[PDB]
Design a protein around this ligand. Structure first.
Ligand SMILES: Cc1cc2nc3c(=O)[nH]c(=O)nc-3n(C[C@H](O)[C@H](O)[C@H](O)COP(=O)(O)OP(=O)(O)OC[C@H]3O[C@@H](n4cnc5c(N)ncnc54)[C@H](O)[C@@H]3O)c2cc1C
Ligand SMILES: Cc1cc2nc3c(=O)[nH]c(=O)nc-3n(C[C@H](O)[C@H](O)[C@H](O)COP(=O)(O)OP(=O)(O)OC[C@H]3O[C@@H](n4cnc5c(N)ncnc54)[C@H](O)[C@@H]3O)c2cc1C
Ligand SMILES: *SCCNC(=O)CCNC(=O)[C@H](O)C(C)(C)COP(=O)(O)OP(=O)(O)OC[C@H]1O[C@@H](n2cnc3c(N)ncnc32)[C@H](O)[C@@H]1OP(=O)(O)O
Ligand SMILES: *SCCNC(=O)CCNC(=O)[C@H](O)C(C)(C)COP(=O)(O)OP(=O)(O)OC[C@H]1O[C@@H](n2cnc3c(N)ncnc32)[C@H](O)[C@@H]1OP(=O)(O)O
Ligand SMILES: CC1=CC(=O)c2ccccc2C1=O
Ligand SMILES: CC1=CC(=O)c2ccccc2C1=O
Lengths: 443, 443
């Protein structure tokens, strides 16, 4: 028809959804209500702004509320949707401006409220040089504190967090990372974690492994971090201890949560309620190797979510077919790419799973400047089915991970990876592509 | 058993076979006869040595006749097998050393004699500044001529040749490329070729298109290149006008040629004669999009051919499943990768084929130093079947082509491409990988 789409949250799933919806069916009244007062910005670039590589923080926005308006889309920042009157039956949508508070109705609802820092229960968190990195505001805050170094503490060695320490080190602070688990990037096989310790340490970052963080010392300021392994002086600390999906609002209106705790969806991004979709980080995506719902709070998947809901509302045929887990991030001079399951995890799932980890180059043995390039392959013993792999490079690609993800997608195997006709030339690959050498091929 | 394997030609198909067979069954008597007096070197790197980027020419050999010996493998360079007494009945092998000339017998024969420059019929080629780039010796020659610039002409705008122009400009000569067809890289869709003219011109290479070269002017030296479009002063000229497989020896012995002119082989690399195999550039490979024999004189495929013959001979189970056409090469600040069919050629084959050519980036809009990145997609109208694609980057990878190859392998479609879970992060890719945007996705 010519109905009214309301998008709650407009960072990435939300923005995505609204832009595509309005493009595909211009007859729709498309409204976005955004709590944070910036909308359509890539958080994924925050470390690069902090580090100073990117001059001003506004350089992260993809579309401004102006451009949106100029394109049929009305966005309202610093608007919080407080209640939804659902089913029940759409009055729905009470929300709060600056000054006021009011009512709206919808015919289509997109929930794209995202996710918020999960905080470990530590005394002192509440204080003053303790920071989080997740929004534009966090950006501003952190960015103010940064000149005037002097010494930083990052709890958690996940992708953000490792990303963080680069940023920090580039700003001159002395940084020290505290992770609770035994390696950096604990969510993945230890080889990789190893490589990253080395590179962290190579660059001046101190890395405490297996640390229980007891509390943050300060009189409302902060200066310490007392830990089981001693006491780290620090005058800024960052919590990079994971996220959790913002589902409070969804549960108000009785939208069903899946096993992971994010909003349960179908291939159309629909929730359990007629006319209500979910998209981005408050959403479950379906994992194709695991063959079940799974949480994958990445930027690319938020965009896919959004675009499918939009498309579907706009009355196009569109379906989101699931994810396989592929991720990549940059810590210093390493580029770390994983996908699927790790061997650790392929085993939790009960496969009879072996891993292989090799180290090759990113160019012919003889070619100037050719780096190192490792690739892992996690596979099912009997069949040979791929289930996971990583590749790490210096390279602004490799990225070669994309192939694995490809093979993962349909249920490919090590035999298949072996058959592939890859690209060879002295600047970019040895004669046998790392992926190929890793295939069966060397133990 | 413990028979005798004779490898004619030991550049890459051959070397690969010898090393693999002797590793896999050390019982074998493995002998490699090689005409050129260098063996196991990478021709692929020659531009890099010509350019000065790589110091000495010997930096390109992968294994020395010494390391081979030390490993059970006896190589004899400067030895040319002049006849084979086959079937007939293996006396077989007459060949020529320094001084002498003798007999040998075989149980296993690998033909890996490769390819030679295909020479166009122009008067004055026979002369003195006219050079070819294929073997190490060509290396040496060219390497000698090169200081003492002054002005070069290259005939042909293929990969080598384009690669050659980079090389020559790097050594300071003024270079001017002559192609007969209308674009550089004429063997692909015109968008790519366009991209390359701009980049070669941007770097001081003059590119003549649609040129008929009439003769090379000189009194045994060379100084000109008379062409339809006028007269190019040149004191070194390079013929980069393609190659043709070295099959003379094989025909002698009554090995069947395929429709391409290369030696016809099966999935085990066996020729039509019992006990005789072929590897590398003298070999047809099976094109999996075209479903027929095809000729793909690349080095990564020679190694595949080589390893397969060797493994089969040594008595392991091995099969060569085919290629899909994947190629990559570097020309200045561009890295150009292709695969499958071009639209031009997908149409020659009679598919109802469309193309799509998009320009994206190699990293988020906002990320420092993010380059451009183009990608094309040649697909069948109905089905959505991928048939070909290209990608061009500055990047040391993207290399992203590897994905299309992957999809090309089983008969993957644009729908499949679209489902793929690719890696995102700001330094390496926009939030939609270029592959994905290109998928259906923008016209
Ligand atoms: C430092 C950092 C680095 C990252 N790097 C990468 C990377 O390299 N690669 C990658 O793929 N991903 C990366 N990500 C992840 C990425 O931020 C997310 O997965 C993505 O932005 C998804 O957005 P979304 O629209 O679901 O919601 P979110 O981005 O979580 O935002 C939703 C917004 O909606 C608002 N909202 C919440 N509740 C309400 C309510 N009740 N009413 C109205 N509005 C509300 C919130 O205030 C919030 O700011 C990174 C993230 C961070 C923080
Ligand atoms: C300048 C240049 C750049 C290149 N760049 C790339 C690239 O970027 N990527 C890529 O994949 N490929 C590239 N290649 C391709 C590559 O060189 C070949 O496809 C590869 O080396 C295959 O070798 P082969 O073993 O089949 O035989 P070849 O390498 O052609 O050599 C066979 C050798 O055996 C000898 N021989 C011939 N006849 C007889 C006989 N009757 N008796 C005894 N011995 C004999 C010959 O003298 C010859 O030197 C490039 C090639 C060149 C020349
Ligand atoms: S145009 C360029 C192509 N032609 C070239 O000349 C380039 C080099 N090619 C050659 O001349 C032949 O490939 C040679 C080197 C003569 C034959 O070499 P091998 O068959 O001996 O190959 P390798 O020794 O390189 O590898 C054989 C085994 O080594 C394993 N392997 C290689 N590299 C690694 C790394 N980085 N990590 C772990 N393992 C590695 C291969 O897996 C292979 O294993 P097998 O299963 O034992 O064959
Ligand atoms: S953590 C980072 C993820 N979140 C971000 O904020 C990153 C940016 N994302 C957004 O906020 C949303 O994606 C926005 C920008 C709000 C929604 O954007 P649109 O949905 O309008 O996206 P685009 O205009 O970028 O693309 C839409 C159509 O444009 C085509 N297209 C994109 N890029 C190219 C290039 N380089 N060449 C040709 N075409 C291109 C897409 O194909 C798309 O096609 P349709 O089929 O028309 O939708
Ligand atoms: C390990 C290794 C072995 C090679 O033979 C080789 C040949 C050509 C390019 C690169 C390589 C390489 O990295
Ligand atoms: C064209 C284009 C559009 C985006 O919305 C975008 C968003 C985040 C990173 C990169 C890009 C990009 O290159």
């Amino acid at each position: 028809m010519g109905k009214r789409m309301v998008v709650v949250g407009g960072v990435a799933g939300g923005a995505s959804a609204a832009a595509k919806a309005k493009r595909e069916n211009p007859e729709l009244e498309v409204v976005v209500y955004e709590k944070s007062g910036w909308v359509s910005y890539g958080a994924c670039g925050l470390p690069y702004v902090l580090s100073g590589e990117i001059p001003r923080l506004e350089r992260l926005v993809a579309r401004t509320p102006e451009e949106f308006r100029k394109q049929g889309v009305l966005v309202h920042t610093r608007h919080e949707v407080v209640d939804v009157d659902y089913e029940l039956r759409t009055l729905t949508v009470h929300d709060h401006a600056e000054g006021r508070t009011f009512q709206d109705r919808f015919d289509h609802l997109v929930l794209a409220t995202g996710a918020r820092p999960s905080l470990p229960p530590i005394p002192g968190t509440e204080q003053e040089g303790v920071y989080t990195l997740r929004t534009m505001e966090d950006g501003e805050r952190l960015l103010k504190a940064l000149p005037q170094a002097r010494r930083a503490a990052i709890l958690g060695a996940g992708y953000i967090g490792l990303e963080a320490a680069e940023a920090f080190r580039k700003r001159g602070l002395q940084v020290t990372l505290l992770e609770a688990k035994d390696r950096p990037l604990p969510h993945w096989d230890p080889e990789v974690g190893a490589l990253l310790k080395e590179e962290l340490e190579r660059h001046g970052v101190e890395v405490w492994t297996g640390v229980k963080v007891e509390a943050f010392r300060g009189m409302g300021r902060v200066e310490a971090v007392e830990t089981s392994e001693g006491v780290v002086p620090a005058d800024l600390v960052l919590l990079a201890t994971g996220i959790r999906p913002n589902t409070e609002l969804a549960q108000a209106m009785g939208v069903a949560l899946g096993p992971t705790g994010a909003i349960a969806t179908d291939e159309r991004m629909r929730t359990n309620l007629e006319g209500v979709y979910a998209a981005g980080d408050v959403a479950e995506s379906f994992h194709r190797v695991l063959k079940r719902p799974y949480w994958l709070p990445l930027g690319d998947v938020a965009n896919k979510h959004g675009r499918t809901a939009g498309s579907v509302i706009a009355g196009r045929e569109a379906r989101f077919l699931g994810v396989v887990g592929t991720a990549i991030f940059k810590a210093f001079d390493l580029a770390v790419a994983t996908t699927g399951l790790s061997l650790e995890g392929a085993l939790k799932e009960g496969f009879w799973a072996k891993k292989v980890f090799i180290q090759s180059r990113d160019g012919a043995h003889y070619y100037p400047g050719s780096g190192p390039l490792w690739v892992e392959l996690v596979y099912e013993e009997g069949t040979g089915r791929l289930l996971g792999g990583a590749v790490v490079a210096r390279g602004h690609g490799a990225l070669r991970i994309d192939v694995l993800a490809a093979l993962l997608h349909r249920e490919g195997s090590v035999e298949d990876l072996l058959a592939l006709d890859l690209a060879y030339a002295p600047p970019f690959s040895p004669v046998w592509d790392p992926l190929l050498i890793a295939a069966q091929q060397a133990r």
